Amino acid sequence: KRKGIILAGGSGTRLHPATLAISKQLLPVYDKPMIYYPLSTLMLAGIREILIISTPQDTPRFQQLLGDGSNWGLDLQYAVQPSPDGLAQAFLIGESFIGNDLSALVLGDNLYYGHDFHELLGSASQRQTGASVFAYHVLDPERYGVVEFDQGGKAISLEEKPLEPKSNYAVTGLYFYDQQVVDIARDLKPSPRGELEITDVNRAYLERGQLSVEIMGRGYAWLDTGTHDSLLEAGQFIATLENRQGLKVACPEEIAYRQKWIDAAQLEKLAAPLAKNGYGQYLKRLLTETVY
Amino acid sequence: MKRKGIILAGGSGTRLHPATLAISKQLLPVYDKPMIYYPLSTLMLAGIREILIISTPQDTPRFQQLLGDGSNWGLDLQYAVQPSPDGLAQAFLIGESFIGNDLSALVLGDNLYYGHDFHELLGSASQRQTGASVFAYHVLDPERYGVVEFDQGGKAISLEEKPLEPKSNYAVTGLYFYDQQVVDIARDLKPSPRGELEITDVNRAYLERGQLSVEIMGRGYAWLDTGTHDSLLEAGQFIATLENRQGLKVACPEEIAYRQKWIDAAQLEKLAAPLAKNGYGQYLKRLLTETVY
Amino acid sequence: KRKGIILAGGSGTRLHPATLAISKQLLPVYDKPMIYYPLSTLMLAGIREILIISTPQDTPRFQQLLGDGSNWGLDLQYAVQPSPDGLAQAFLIGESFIGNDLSALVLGDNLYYGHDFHELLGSASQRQTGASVFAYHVLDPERYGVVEFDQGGKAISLEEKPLEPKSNYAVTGLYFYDQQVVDIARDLKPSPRGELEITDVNRAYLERGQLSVEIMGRGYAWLDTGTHDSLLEAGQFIATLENRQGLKVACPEEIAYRQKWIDAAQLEKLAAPLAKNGYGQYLKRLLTETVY
Amino acid sequence: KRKGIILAGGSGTRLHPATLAISKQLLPVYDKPMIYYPLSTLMLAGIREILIISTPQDTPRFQQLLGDGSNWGLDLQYAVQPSPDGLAQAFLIGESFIGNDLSALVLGDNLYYGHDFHELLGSASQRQTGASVFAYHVLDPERYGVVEFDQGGKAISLEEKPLEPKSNYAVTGLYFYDQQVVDIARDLKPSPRGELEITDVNRAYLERGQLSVEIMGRGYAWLDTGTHDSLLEAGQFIATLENRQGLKVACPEEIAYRQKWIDAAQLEKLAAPLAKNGYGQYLKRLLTETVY
Ligand SMILES: Cc1cn([C@H]2C[C@H](O)[C@@H](COP(=O)(O)OP(=O)(O)O[C@H]3O[C@@H](C)[C@H](O)[C@@H](O)[C@H]3O)O2)c(=O)[nH]c1=O
Ligand SMILES: Cc1cn([C@H]2C[C@H](O)[C@@H](COP(=O)(O)OP(=O)(O)O[C@H]3O[C@@H](C)[C@H](O)[C@@H](O)[C@H]3O)O2)c(=O)[nH]c1=O
Ligand SMILES: Cc1cn([C@H]2C[C@H](O)[C@@H](COP(=O)(O)OP(=O)(O)O[C@H]3O[C@@H](C)[C@H](O)[C@@H](O)[C@H]3O)O2)c(=O)[nH]c1=O
Ligand SMILES: Cc1cn([C@H]2C[C@H](O)[C@@H](COP(=O)(O)OP(=O)(O)O[C@H]3O[C@@H](C)[C@H](O)[C@@H](O)[C@H]3O)O2)c(=O)[nH]c1=O
Ligand SMILES: Cc1cn([C@H]2C[C@H](O)[C@@H](COP(=O)(O)OP(=O)(O)O[C@H]3O[C@@H](C)[C@H](O)[C@@H](O)[C@H]3O)O2)c(=O)[nH]c1=O
Ligand SMILES: Cc1cn([C@H]2C[C@H](O)[C@@H](COP(=O)(O)OP(=O)(O)O[C@H]3O[C@@H](C)[C@H](O)[C@@H](O)[C@H]3O)O2)c(=O)[nH]c1=O
Ligand SMILES: Cc1cn([C@H]2C[C@H](O)[C@@H](COP(=O)(O)OP(=O)(O)O[C@H]3O[C@@H](C)[C@H](O)[C@@H](O)[C@H]3O)O2)c(=O)[nH]c1=O
Ligand SMILES: Cc1cn([C@H]2C[C@H](O)[C@@H](COP(=O)(O)OP(=O)(O)O[C@H]3O[C@@H](C)[C@H](O)[C@@H](O)[C@H]3O)O2)c(=O)[nH]c1=O
């Protein structure tokens, strides 16, 4: 039984002033709020119980937007992070939420897409021990935690924001942990940057041969909307997919319905209030179209 | 005389839902800054410093959170609320006491204007002391808008709102200049079948006294309205292209307030500090020591 | 041992005047010529021997661009289509090129991209019987040959450009055939439209229970650059992936090298002439970076 | 009476391999061939007699595309540049074409757009002495000939590709000359770069107080399609204007018709062949819609 966390806080000083009125994760990527995407990633992982962490000031808004989850077959909860002191904090804040269960962490501005991504999630999720993460070839590795591989393609070390990256493989912002993560987090000390580092967590698992690093191929999309230009591109990527296919990406109603977490009657009900527009119309259509 | 401005930034996004489920359209970014900044900037360029921002009761706080009282940019921003999107013309009823006995000007919060000499264009409308001024712009789908009919000499003779059969492809954009007759005109309007108070009815009133001036806004200008997911995309992109080629930014209030001497160098510096770690802040700093024509 | 054909003729009247001076297929999608994309598709299918069909007028230009193929480990050949009389014509024009081998046909303006697309291709290409095609959910199936599924998801019929589509599954423009296709194409009669229809070819296989229709999931991208707008989006989809990953899509030098059809020396030499730009720089970098 | 030259040769080494088969200036920007853009610029300046300069290899195609000009009321001629030895070369190659007339030069991959651009053109074109150029604020002036201003805003010097730009005003690729340009070009010596430099021409005029530098404001768009990314953006810019307005940019048929260089009958005739598509339909529509 794995629980999930979405870490949707952070300042956004960068993308100011665009993000001065509202956290980034509530801004739309093309046609729907950013947080939907990562939300849909956990859903696809088979996770239904989820803790949304954010700034004190934007929780309400997150809640306004997502409610308790029941309408989509979910159980959402909320927690607050007063200061953006490190991904790993998510586990301290989320400790009692997690209890004795396996868990998963995903960044609220991280957008993933691709063929068999669902199976990919499935495999990580279904592991009952250790940790799983993902490595993705990128242009500037140095921004992220970077992984080093030996000659046989096995991961052998990690370095956070190295001056000189040993590879272009970055650790994406999706993480699956077993019951060691809380305690590992509790023993962490702030790095010179001043944060509690997920890399440090990942390393701890790696130092006991329990970290599993799956390469995420160039066929998948891992987009993070870290800059105005990237925010733009992402919105576009999705618009492109959406207008060709006639299907939508990261639409929670659909996933819930496909997973049988809600039934047709429920889906109809969710659609009424959105009937005057594309989105509602899409949901209706889903009730009478087999989509493979 | 002096002119006050209104930015009507309420309205549903019901269309745009669910994107707009968490915040109002007008607070979403067009590329690199909040939408409302654009029309805000339009009024500023019109020489208008005293401005009333109308929005849904629920989003006023967030508008306020973003723009403050205006004093930082040498402006005076007030705020008001529109419980229900009952027509552009309601603005004047809502902003009656804000307007008082001055000339005014209404702009739509999701309307984006850009082009060479747009400043002189504003200047002219703004400096007219009587009557009203609006703008006509060739578009693909005039039927979505209030449409203007012209005689053989290019003089506007009629207006129809959302006609089934448009008499021309010239739409009235969402930027309007009025003298002191607008409030009363607005106070005598009855809702159309759509159920709204129609700015077109307002415009027609002025036209029916030979006091509506309709300036053609040529194809050289951009009038974009971010009405759909796609158009929102295109706009952001339209802006991104100009900005990355020029090294200048569109609709950046700090810059306009400085250029118009509404704030001084010291004030501009101080506005920049908090944003230094990023492009936006860096830009402001750069403006202190570069002559930009 | 399967041979490939790229059909890259066709008029672009629709696309005039943009394509008045040069065939559609030689226009760039973002940073390399459109034909490279489908070219890459066949390469990834394991196909090295390929016939490029085009208008009489533009062949020389296609030749000028791709050469005989030796440089990328291919054997490219050329043929001409005076008139755009149907996809199926490719098999009459290509009859002797094909001889007694398995084959595949891909449209020159069809761009495919996704995770495990290579395995997808592998499976279809290694089949030693019947035909394989792909079905993809789109917004305007009426533009294409549409497939009909029964309640167990098995294909039961096809209709080219139907007034009322039985489903939103369009048959993409990628086709794998066994030795039956030539004789089948030889007995086709022109449809009312005046063309020899691949749908009729697809149907012939279907009528014997030898047509395999694989669903291509929403995780893959099937884009076809059939309108100004879409050509735009496509270019932009590619740029988005390329600028995030630091990898390039459909870059034949790379694919050849990855498949060991050319060696590092060959790759170095291919890059020299392009050294003063990104494309060349990319090639070089491939010689010293492991890319998974 | 001024004559115009469009310089559309050059190497695309940078944009390889995209441009290996055809010259960039024959690729489309969104919905029509690039060269249409500059072509329209000259037309808007009231210039009807034009020399198109290009590689030896692509002239034929340029000619195929644009004809002798008579269909659009122009008089087009052609010449060739075996090697891209500098913008000033256009004047040696174009000497006899120019004879004793005033002239103008525009780059073939330079796209201009804006309100009252036509009047801007008119003013420069009607000057009967000296030279006129335009200065425009850009992000990367070091890529261009840069201009330096005094405290009154008067141009005082030019540097081509300066390590350290004195300003961010670049000299765009649009130039108007009186009868001194040829002889000035005739006495140029190749810079270290190995080209005859238009900046050197512009300086010659500047040294006699006969160079007029007009600032082209941030309201105008000066885009050059010098990189994959910018070629994209440009396409996008245009599509965005076009689909909002229902008017098209740089559509020679229209400009000629507006300037009374062709009459309605001729316009109809030009549209017939393109009737099945947007472009044609647009031309038709122009016959019965007043457009201010
Ligand atoms: C530090 C922190 C960030 N965040 C949010 C804000 C941003 O949206 C986003 C990331 O902040 P950053 O400064 O980019 O985190 P970061 O600089 O730690 O970036 C991380 O990138 C990760 C993907 C890598 O896997 C890590 O190895 C690390 O490189 O997440 C929080 O919500 N809370 C926090 O305490
Ligand atoms: C190798 C390669 C692929 N491609 C294209 C083909 C596909 O559209 C897309 C992804 O290619 P594929 O190889 O089908 O999938 P992939 O590269 O995303 O996935 C690979 O991930 C690797 C880590 C695993 O070891 C492989 O088993 C496979 O899963 O990229 C290129 O354009 N150029 C290339 O050089
Ligand atoms: C009606 C209304 C809209 N708005 C916001 C909603 C959108 O953000 C934007 C426009 O709303 P619409 O329903 O499209 O307005 P509209 O349907 O009144 O369209 C207007 O279009 C103008 C450009 C024309 O000049 C007018 O003639 C008129 O046609 O206005 C409000 O804030 N309050 C309101 O009462
Ligand atoms: C100054 C400024 C302008 N703008 C936008 C407003 C308009 O939409 C667009 C064009 O600016 P305008 O002042 O209308 O025109 P312009 O700045 O393109 O043209 C100017 O060219 C100058 C060199 C001449 O001296 C001036 O007379 C004027 O023509 O600029 C901003 O968004 N922010 C700003 O700070
Ligand atoms: C006429 C025309 C212009 N253009 C380009 C030229 C410029 O880049 C831009 C705008 O054209 P211009 O005519 O320079 O500006 P404009 O058309 O935006 O402005 C005109 O507005 C009119 C209402 C006024 O009556 C005119 O005096 C002038 O102000 O459009 C075309 O691409 N095709 C065309 O057919
Ligand atoms: C007909 C034809 C097209 N072409 C090129 C031109 C276009 O770029 C592209 C397809 O042209 P169209 O006229 O759209 O062909 P088409 O209308 O037959 O389209 C096809 O789509 C495939 C994807 C489906 O599998 C088919 O069932 C079919 O619908 O083919 C040729 O090169 N030669 C030809 O004879
Ligand atoms: C189902 C679904 C997926 N997605 C996302 C998940 C991925 O990013 C991408 C599609 O991912 P997947 O569903 O993992 O892969 P897929 O849908 O491309 O492929 C599927 O093709 C099917 C026919 C096969 O039977 C499955 O085995 C699988 O191959 O879309 C949504 O956003 N909404 C959805 O409702
Ligand atoms: C040099 C040259 C270029 N060209 C074409 C190729 C490109 O499409 C276009 C630009 O060439 P470049 O090598 O970028 O030119 P360039 O590097 O000479 O750039 C010029 O940029 C101008 C705009 C400035 O006004 C000049 O100051 C100068 O900087 O010129 C020719 O057709 N023939 C030639 O001899």
Side-chain angles (χ1 to χ4, degrees):
Chain A
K1 150 76 133 154
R2 199 180 299 269
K3 291 179 154 148
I5 300 173
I6 299 167
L7 175 68
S11 72
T13 331
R14 221 150 316 157
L15 308 178
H16 291 190
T19 43
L20 268 168
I22 191 88
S23 302
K24 171 180 170 178
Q25 305 77 179
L26 295 167
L27 298 181
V29 177
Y30 183 46
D31 57 359
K32 61 190 98 63
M34 189 180 309
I35 187 144
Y36 273 29
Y37 296 85
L39 179 56
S40 80
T41 289
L42 300 178
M43 292 173 81
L44 287 165
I47 298 173
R48 301 184 71 182
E49 189 161 5
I50 299 170
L51 170 63
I52 289 158
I53 293 180
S54 109
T55 62
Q57 176 191 25
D58 280 340
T59 263
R61 288 278 178 166
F62 279 90
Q63 286 187 16
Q64 178 171 13
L65 168 69
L66 311 172
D68 60 16
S70 48
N71 290 325
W72 301 345
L74 311 177
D75 173 8
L76 304 177
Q77 301 195 48
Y78 299 86
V80 145
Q81 188 189 21
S83 194
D85 290 344
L87 301 213
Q89 241 192 8
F91 296 91
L92 306 187
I93 294 156
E95 174 172 3
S96 93
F97 162 76
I98 286 173
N100 275 312
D101 299 313
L102 307 160
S103 68
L105 172 63
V106 73
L107 296 173
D109 55 11
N110 268 222
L111 200 169
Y112 293 97
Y113 193 82
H115 185 241
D116 287 347
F117 186 47
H118 167 91
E119 293 68 351
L120 187 59
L121 291 170
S123 303
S125 200
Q126 280 155 54
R127 284 201 173 228
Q128 285 162 352
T129 60
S132 301
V133 304
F134 303 96
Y136 189 82
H137 192 291
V138 287
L139 191 56
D140 57 289
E142 65 281 358
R143 269 169 58 223
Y144 300 111
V146 177
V147 5
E148 190 181 3
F149 298 94
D150 62 10
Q151 267 158 36
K154 179 211 186 185
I156 59 174
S157 72
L158 312 157
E159 243 196 303
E160 177 68 48
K161 292 182 171 52
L163 277 176
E164 301 189 7
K166 266 147 198 154
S167 91
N168 286 304
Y169 287 93
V171 182
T172 82
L174 169 56
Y175 319 92
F176 289 75
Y177 301 105
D178 75 3
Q179 315 136 282
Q180 308 176 81
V181 66
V182 172
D183 289 350
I184 285 153
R186 285 173 62 109
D187 292 338
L188 289 179
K189 299 282 169 186
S191 35
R193 272 212 287 188
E195 325 189 6
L196 299 169
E197 310 263 15
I198 207 62
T199 285
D200 280 349
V201 166
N202 295 336
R203 186 168 307 108
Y205 275 96
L206 177 66
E207 279 171 359
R208 314 143 195 270
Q210 277 175 357
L211 170 74
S212 154
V213 178
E214 309 277 9
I215 304 300
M216 175 177 289
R218 68 212 275 170
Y220 289 103
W222 173 47
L223 304 179
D224 107 39
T225 56
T227 84
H228 302 316
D229 294 288
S230 48
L231 176 58
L232 209 42
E233 277 169 35
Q236 261 164 333
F237 182 81
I238 295 295
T240 294
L241 289 173
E242 284 186 351
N243 295 333
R244 177 52 160 170
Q245 294 181 2
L247 307 166
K248 287 168 154 44
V249 172
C251 141
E253 293 83 354
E254 170 170 13
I255 285 143
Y257 175 62
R258 292 181 71 81
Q259 304 257 39
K260 325 237 167 311
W261 292 349
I262 62 187
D263 57 38
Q266 285 162 322
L267 181 54
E268 211 169 313
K269 201 162 138 174
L270 289 177
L274 307 144
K276 295 309 193 161
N277 77 67
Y279 201 89
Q281 282 153 49
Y282 181 70
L283 303 189
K284 305 220 170 179
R285 179 160 50 90
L286 289 193
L287 301 155
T288 57
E289 166 176 19
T290 286
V291 172
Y292 307 105
Chain B
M1 308 191 287
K2 112 106 119 175
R3 196 178 302 267
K4 297 173 154 151
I6 301 175
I7 304 169
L8 171 73
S12 85
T14 312
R15 193 175 319 158
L16 292 191
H17 287 174
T20 33
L21 265 175
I23 0 141
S24 279
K25 193 181 163 178
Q26 290 90 169
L27 291 166
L28 298 182
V30 177
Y31 182 48
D32 60 354
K33 64 194 92 63
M35 197 183 295
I36 185 147
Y37 270 36
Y38 293 79
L40 176 53
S41 85
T42 288
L43 298 178
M44 285 169 69
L45 288 158
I48 297 169
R49 299 181 74 174
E50 182 159 13
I51 296 171
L52 167 70
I53 287 161
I54 301 171
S55 89
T56 56
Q58 157 182 343
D59 274 338
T60 249
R62 296 281 180 166
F63 282 95
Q64 280 176 270
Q65 191 163 44
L66 169 72
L67 314 173
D69 73 11
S71 36
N72 293 322
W73 297 345
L75 311 162
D76 167 6
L77 301 187
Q78 305 270 322
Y79 295 88
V81 136
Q82 190 189 23
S84 185
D86 293 339
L88 294 219
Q90 244 189 4
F92 293 89
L93 309 185
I94 291 161
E96 184 170 357
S97 98
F98 169 75
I99 288 179
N101 281 311
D102 304 309
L103 309 159
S104 55
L106 170 72
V107 73
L108 295 175
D110 60 13
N111 266 225
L112 198 168
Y113 296 90
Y114 193 85
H116 179 242
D117 282 345
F118 186 53
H119 171 88
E120 290 70 338
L121 188 60
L122 290 175
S124 295
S126 214
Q127 287 154 43
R128 286 201 172 231
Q129 282 165 342
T130 59
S133 293
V134 309
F135 305 99
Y137 189 88
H138 198 288
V139 290
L140 191 50
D141 301 286
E143 60 291 338
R144 275 168 53 218
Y145 302 107
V147 178
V148 8
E149 192 183 0
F150 302 90
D151 63 10
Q152 294 301 339
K155 173 218 194 186
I157 56 171
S158 89
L159 313 163
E160 245 188 310
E161 174 65 47
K162 285 174 174 50
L164 273 177
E165 301 192 4
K167 264 154 208 137
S168 103
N169 293 304
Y170 290 89
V172 181
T173 83
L175 171 52
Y176 319 93
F177 294 76
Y178 301 112
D179 66 2
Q180 298 125 316
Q181 301 175 82
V182 59
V183 170
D184 286 347
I185 280 150
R187 293 174 56 106
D188 304 332
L189 296 170
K190 300 280 171 190
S192 41
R194 273 209 277 189
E196 323 186 15
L197 300 162
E198 308 277 6
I199 206 60
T200 286
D201 286 351
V202 166
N203 295 324
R204 190 175 305 109
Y206 271 107
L207 181 64
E208 276 170 353
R209 310 156 210 268
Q211 277 184 336
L212 170 74
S213 148
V214 179
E215 309 277 4
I216 308 303
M217 176 175 290
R219 67 213 283 178
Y221 293 106
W223 170 49
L224 306 174
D225 106 34
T226 56
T228 79
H229 292 136
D230 297 283
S231 54
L232 172 57
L233 223 34
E234 276 167 302
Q237 177 68 254
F238 178 83
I239 295 294
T241 286
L242 292 171
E243 281 189 348
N244 292 322
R245 175 59 166 162
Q246 296 183 355
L248 308 170
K249 278 164 165 49
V250 179
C252 148
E254 297 91 336
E255 166 172 10
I256 289 148
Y258 177 57
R259 284 179 81 84
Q260 308 253 47
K261 326 231 165 312
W262 295 342
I263 62 184
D264 62 21
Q267 293 166 309
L268 180 50
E269 215 171 307
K270 191 173 142 162
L271 290 175
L275 303 148
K277 298 313 195 147
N278 69 53
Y280 200 93
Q282 280 142 56
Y283 180 74
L284 302 192
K285 305 221 168 177
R286 172 156 61 81
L287 287 198
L288 300 157
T289 55
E290 159 175 25
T291 285
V292 176
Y293 308 105
Chain C
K1 174 62 183 180
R2 188 182 298 266
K3 295 177 155 144
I5 300 179
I6 303 166
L7 176 62
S11 94
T13 325
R14 194 178 321 143
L15 290 194
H16 287 176
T19 62
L20 261 167
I22 189 79
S23 277
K24 174 164 165 198
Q25 302 90 338
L26 294 167
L27 300 178
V29 176
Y30 183 47
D31 60 352
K32 64 198 87 76
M34 192 186 304
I35 189 144
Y36 273 34
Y37 292 83
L39 177 56
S40 81
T41 293
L42 301 181
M43 286 170 79
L44 285 154
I47 295 170
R48 298 179 78 175
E49 188 167 355
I50 298 169
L51 172 66
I52 290 163
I53 294 176
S54 85
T55 54
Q57 166 163 32
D58 279 344
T59 260
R61 289 279 178 169
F62 279 94
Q63 288 168 12
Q64 184 171 358
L65 166 73
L66 305 169
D68 62 16
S70 35
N71 283 330
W72 298 340
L74 313 175
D75 172 356
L76 299 178
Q77 299 212 73
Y78 300 85
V80 135
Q81 187 180 40
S83 193
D85 284 8
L87 301 217
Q89 236 198 3
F91 294 96
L92 307 186
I93 291 151
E95 177 166 4
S96 88
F97 165 77
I98 290 166
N100 286 309
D101 300 308
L102 303 160
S103 57
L105 169 72
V106 74
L107 299 175
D109 52 15
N110 269 219
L111 197 171
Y112 295 92
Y113 191 83
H115 186 244
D116 281 340
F117 185 52
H118 164 74
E119 293 63 352
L120 187 56
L121 294 168
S123 289
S125 207
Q126 287 154 35
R127 288 206 159 200
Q128 295 160 350
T129 169
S132 279
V133 306
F134 304 88
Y136 189 81
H137 195 279
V138 295
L139 187 56
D140 298 273
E142 61 288 344
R143 275 171 52 206
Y144 304 110
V146 177
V147 7
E148 195 190 357
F149 302 93
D150 69 9
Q151 231 102 94
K154 185 219 178 190
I156 58 178
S157 107
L158 309 157
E159 243 202 310
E160 179 60 45
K161 288 179 178 59
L163 279 176
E164 305 245 358
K166 261 158 214 129
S167 100
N168 293 313
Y169 286 79
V171 182
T172 83
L174 173 49
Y175 318 97
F176 290 79
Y177 298 115
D178 69 356
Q179 296 155 328
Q180 294 181 82
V181 65
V182 171
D183 284 348
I184 281 157
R186 288 175 63 102
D187 296 339
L188 294 175
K189 298 273 171 194
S191 55
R193 274 208 276 182
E195 326 194 17
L196 298 167
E197 311 271 3
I198 208 67
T199 289
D200 289 353
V201 169
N202 290 338
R203 193 173 302 103
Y205 274 98
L206 181 69
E207 270 155 3
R208 311 166 134 245
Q210 287 173 358
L211 175 75
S212 162
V213 174
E214 312 268 2
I215 307 310
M216 172 172 294
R218 65 208 276 170
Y220 292 105
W222 173 51
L223 307 178
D224 104 39
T225 61
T227 86
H228 291 129
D229 289 297
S230 51
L231 168 57
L232 225 34
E233 282 170 57
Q236 178 99 54
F237 180 83
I238 292 302
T240 283
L241 297 163
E242 280 189 355
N243 302 324
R244 178 63 172 156
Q245 300 186 356
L247 302 172
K248 289 177 154 28
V249 178
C251 148
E253 298 88 338
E254 169 169 10
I255 283 146
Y257 170 65
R258 284 183 74 83
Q259 311 256 40
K260 328 237 165 307
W261 298 342
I262 59 183
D263 62 21
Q266 285 158 326
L267 186 43
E268 208 167 315
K269 193 166 139 175
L270 283 181
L274 303 150
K276 297 313 191 140
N277 77 56
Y279 199 98
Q281 279 147 57
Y282 179 69
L283 300 191
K284 309 217 164 176
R285 170 163 54 89
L286 288 192
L287 296 163
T288 49
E289 156 180 23
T290 285
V291 171
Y292 304 103
Chain D
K1 170 61 135 151
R2 184 182 307 265
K3 296 176 153 144
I5 300 179
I6 304 168
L7 174 69
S11 90
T13 339
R14 198 177 319 141
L15 295 194
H16 291 173
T19 49
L20 265 181
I22 1 78
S23 281
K24 187 164 73 136
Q25 307 98 185
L26 298 166
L27 299 176
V29 171
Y30 184 49
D31 63 0
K32 64 198 87 71
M34 198 183 295
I35 185 142
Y36 273 33
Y37 295 87
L39 174 58
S40 71
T41 295
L42 298 182
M43 286 171 74
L44 286 162
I47 301 181
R48 302 178 73 173
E49 189 165 8
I50 300 164
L51 174 65
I52 287 163
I53 300 184
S54 88
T55 55
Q57 165 183 16
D58 269 353
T59 249
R61 296 263 177 177
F62 275 99
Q63 282 176 314
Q64 177 158 358
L65 162 72
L66 311 170
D68 63 23
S70 35
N71 294 320
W72 298 343
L74 314 177
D75 174 2
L76 300 185
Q77 298 183 50
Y78 296 94
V80 137
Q81 185 182 34
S83 187
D85 290 0
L87 305 225
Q89 236 190 17
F91 293 91
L92 307 183
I93 295 161
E95 183 169 1
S96 98
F97 161 78
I98 286 172
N100 290 310
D101 295 330
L102 305 157
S103 67
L105 170 66
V106 77
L107 291 176
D109 59 0
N110 268 223
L111 205 164
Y112 295 89
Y113 192 85
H115 181 257
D116 283 336
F117 186 53
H118 168 61
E119 291 59 2
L120 184 60
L121 288 171
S123 286
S125 212
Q126 283 154 46
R127 285 212 162 195
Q128 295 171 348
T129 174
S132 286
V133 308
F134 305 90
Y136 186 88
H137 192 293
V138 290
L139 185 54
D140 304 293
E142 62 283 352
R143 264 171 62 220
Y144 302 105
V146 180
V147 8
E148 186 181 355
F149 303 94
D150 62 20
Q151 290 203 329
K154 180 217 185 185
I156 59 183
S157 101
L158 308 159
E159 260 189 297
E160 177 67 42
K161 282 179 180 61
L163 281 174
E164 306 197 11
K166 264 154 209 140
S167 92
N168 290 305
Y169 289 81
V171 180
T172 85
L174 170 52
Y175 321 94
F176 293 82
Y177 297 109
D178 71 3
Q179 292 145 350
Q180 295 177 78
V181 64
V182 171
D183 292 346
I184 280 152
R186 284 174 68 107
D187 299 328
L188 289 177
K189 304 271 177 189
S191 47
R193 259 218 287 190
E195 332 189 358
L196 303 167
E197 308 276 9
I198 207 70
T199 290
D200 288 349
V201 169
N202 294 327
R203 191 171 300 109
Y205 276 96
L206 178 73
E207 272 154 9
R208 309 134 83 48
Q210 285 172 353
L211 178 70
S212 158
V213 177
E214 307 276 356
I215 308 309
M216 176 173 294
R218 66 207 281 170
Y220 291 108
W222 175 49
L223 307 177
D224 88 18
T225 65
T227 76
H228 304 309
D229 294 285
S230 58
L231 168 63
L232 206 46
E233 273 168 56
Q236 256 157 351
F237 185 80
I238 294 304
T240 289
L241 293 164
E242 282 190 353
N243 301 322
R244 179 49 167 166
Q245 292 186 357
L247 303 171
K248 295 198 162 209
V249 172
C251 152
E253 297 87 338
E254 169 168 7
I255 283 154
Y257 172 60
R258 282 177 80 86
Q259 306 253 54
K260 319 246 166 302
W261 298 345
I262 62 183
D263 68 20
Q266 293 160 303
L267 176 48
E268 217 167 298
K269 196 169 131 168
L270 287 174
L274 305 149
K276 299 309 195 146
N277 74 55
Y279 199 92
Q281 284 151 49
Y282 179 76
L283 298 192
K284 300 219 177 167
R285 173 163 55 96
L286 285 195
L287 292 160
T288 56
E289 159 181 25
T290 288
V291 176
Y292 305 106

